[PDB]
Ligand binder design. Structure first.
Ligand SMILES: NC(=O)C1=CN([C@@H]2O[C@H](COP(=O)(O)OP(=O)(O)OC[C@H]3O[C@@H](n4cnc5c(N)ncnc54)[C@H](OP(=O)(O)O)[C@@H]3O)[C@@H](O)[C@H]2O)C=CC1
Ligand SMILES: NC(=O)C1=CN([C@@H]2O[C@H](COP(=O)(O)OP(=O)(O)OC[C@H]3O[C@@H](n4cnc5c(N)ncnc54)[C@H](OP(=O)(O)O)[C@@H]3O)[C@@H](O)[C@H]2O)C=CC1
Ligand SMILES: [Zn+2]
Ligand SMILES: [Zn+2]
Lengths: 357, 357
């Protein structure tokens, strides 16, 4: 079978061949339909070759997959089922409490593999296998954009934990502010528009010049574009209003600190960004006091699990068609896959199509 | 009646006289039994005279009161009821959503008064009044140490919010680390010992040399004393273990930052400290990434309300007698009240006795 991979010492994704996998007990064989490209794929391609599987020359890319079950094997799935795989699998040493308790998304460093990211091949091959417990059935009509279910699920989990932080009181948020205009930020912005919390005012932070398709999406969702070069996060309460909810998706460390200042009393920041170490001058006293005197929270979140993938299917149905059309800037056949790894301002979410149903 | 107050331009608490208050509709008249002294009382005495009531020459001190109802007026309380007052009352402009929804503890700055702290006289007078809704009945045998109910309630709320942050998954903490060996830290340490979470290992951070009565309390509770001069917060995972729960009660801004590093994956820090602005070099990138990759939370908490005072009475019953004996270093009759404002290492929790039942 064909697969798209990064090889050791190389700086580009390429087509390789490897045998079609065979499902072990409790696993189904899946024919890959479409796989989304993400920042993490770009990070692997950049020179992050520490994530390769034990004793292997390459890493198959892609962790945002949708496929069709072609061999249900000894599982309870049926042939023809449209499924999305979860990302996390047990590490080398085998299972642990996180996997046993059906919460591998809460497993710490070294206690999981992530397919297409660290320790395990991804989904950008014509076929893959997975335990039935990690295959989430989705509605058949979500096959076309099914590669979106995984990133939606990231937000489903983050919101679940952030909202849990506020559950000891009657929290009544009216404003939400997404930091970041990548596909995650933009997905989250549309999600917050359909959120039960009934947000009145939505904002999204970026740093683009017009004309820009992320600005257009933000504005078409009836949200305010906040150009950080004009109005930084801490200035936002002056220029706009205090934000009950902040969802951080920039990976900018200053935003973790400054979100505390931009928050309304009793608000929560969800942090999703993954920055490298970076030291600079912080008014920790103001950070600390503001958290306390105004009963604020910061909640970090990573990965997601089955419940979040199921929630994502419901959320998907509520997402506007125009939005899905504009968010997905290109689906590329495997024949011309290289275009999927385009990275520029007009490129929002791409995917590679391996087959059709 | 007699009261203990700070007057404008003066640097010491003194006895004053003012008329006995008369209960308005919905209020009871209370005879003050005992009032605890806290750090906030010391801060008022220091030169924080911005908290005085509108157009008044003095602030009556004390916010940790226990008393006996002597006139139930038109309320549902009975004469002889032992009660503890909540601290927060409506601001000048009158009621608001926080007060209306029975959550004034979540009111932001300027939207409340705190009796004995800002905008309203405290409880260090022979008599006081309060709405029945802010008077919490407690068991009669808690009259002697009833001034402890308010600070216990501070922790009851903080734990409620911190634990709420962890409620989206099956959190199974085994370790807890209290930062601070003031009366709040020590109360919290004994509370975490009787907490349903069933903590296996307890730690408390201080910076005292032996012999010291706070060290003795920590060790007698079967907790580990962590001298920050030896093992700072960030070093604690090396020397000891990663902490599932951290309760910050130092008011040291570095501890807000460093608690993130000392936390176990999926852990939460409660912040209670109130520092002034203080800027210094922080590795914000490491702070940010650690929050996210390891699904951690920070939750700030201030004040408390009726539900927390009720919970505090239950917790009180579970507290060891030796602990209560050792925690309360002096109860001083009003006649010799000055000793209550002693502030040294052997002084833990003091109170002033205005009357007996
Ligand atoms: N915790 C988790 O499970 C997950 C975490 N992530 C992380 O979340 C973050 C967002 O993911 P994704 O949206 O896909 O990644 P992107 O890098 O594509 O999105 C980040 C966006 O933030 C913008 N940005 C960065 N700094 C600033 C700033 N100072 N002011 C205004 N805008 C800024 C960038 O704008 P510009 O292009 O103009 O520079 C970019 O469009 C990343 O750090 C990623 O690592 C992603 C997926 C899951
Ligand atoms: N949010 C809320 O509702 C409430 C907040 N507070 C706040 O919580 C904090 C604790 O209250 P309380 O216990 O009564 O106050 P204390 O000041 O009496 O307690 C703080 C303790 O922390 C210790 N400490 C300070 N810095 C360090 C450090 N670097 N290393 C080790 N120990 C340190 C001090 O030790 P030492 O004496 O040796 O210097 C002191 O014993 C205060 O900041 C207070 O303002 C208090 C009540 C309610
Ligand atoms: Zn993804
Ligand atoms: Zn108190």
């Amino acid at each position: 079978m064909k697969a798209i991979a990064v090889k050791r010492g190389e700086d580009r994704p390429v087509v390789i061949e490897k045998p079609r996998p065979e499902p072990e007990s409790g696993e189904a064989l899946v024919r890959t339909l479409r796989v989304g490209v993400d920042g993490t794929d770009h990070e692997v391609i950049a020179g992050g070759h520490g994530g390769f599987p034990e004793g292997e020359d390459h890493l198959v890319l892609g962790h945002e997959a949708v496929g069709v079950v072609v061999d249900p094997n000894d599982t309870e799935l049926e042939e023809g089922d449209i499924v999305v795989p979860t990302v996390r699998r047990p590490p080398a040493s085998g299972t642990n409490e996180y996997f046993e308790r059906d919460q591998p998304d809460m497993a710490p460093d070294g206690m999981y593999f992530e397919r297409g990211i660290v320790g395990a091949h991804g989904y950008m091959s014509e076929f893959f296998t997975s335990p039935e417990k990690y295959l989430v059935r989705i509605p058949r009509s979500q096959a076309e954009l099914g590669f979106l279910i995984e990133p939606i699920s990231i937000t489903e989990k983050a919101l679940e934990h952030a909202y849990a932080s506020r559950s000891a009181f009657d929290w009544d948020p009216s404003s939400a502010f997404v930091l970041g205009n990548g596909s995650l930020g933009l997905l989250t912005l549309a999600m917050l528009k359909v959120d039960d919390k009934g947000y009145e005012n939505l904002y999204c932070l970026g740093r683009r010049d017009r004309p820009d398709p992320t600005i257009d999406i933000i504005e078409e969702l009836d949200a305010t574009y906040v150009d950080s070069r004009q109005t930084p996060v801490e200035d936002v309460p002056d220029v706009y209003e205090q934000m009950d909810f902040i969802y951080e998706a920039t990976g900018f460390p200053k935003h973790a600190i400054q979100s505390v200042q931009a928050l309304a009393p009793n608000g929560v920041g969800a942090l999703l960004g993954v920055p490298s170490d970076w030291a600079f001058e912080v008014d920790a006293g103001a950070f600390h006091r503001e958290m306390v005197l105004h009963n604020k929270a910061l909640v970090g979140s990573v990965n997601s699990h089955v419940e979040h993938f199921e929630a994502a299917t419901v959320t998907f149905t509520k997402l506007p068609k125009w939005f899905l059309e504009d968010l997905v800037t290109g689906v590329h056949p495997l024949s011309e896959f290289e275009a999927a790894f385009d990275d520029d301002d007009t490129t929002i979410k791409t995917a590679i199509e391996f087959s059709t149903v």
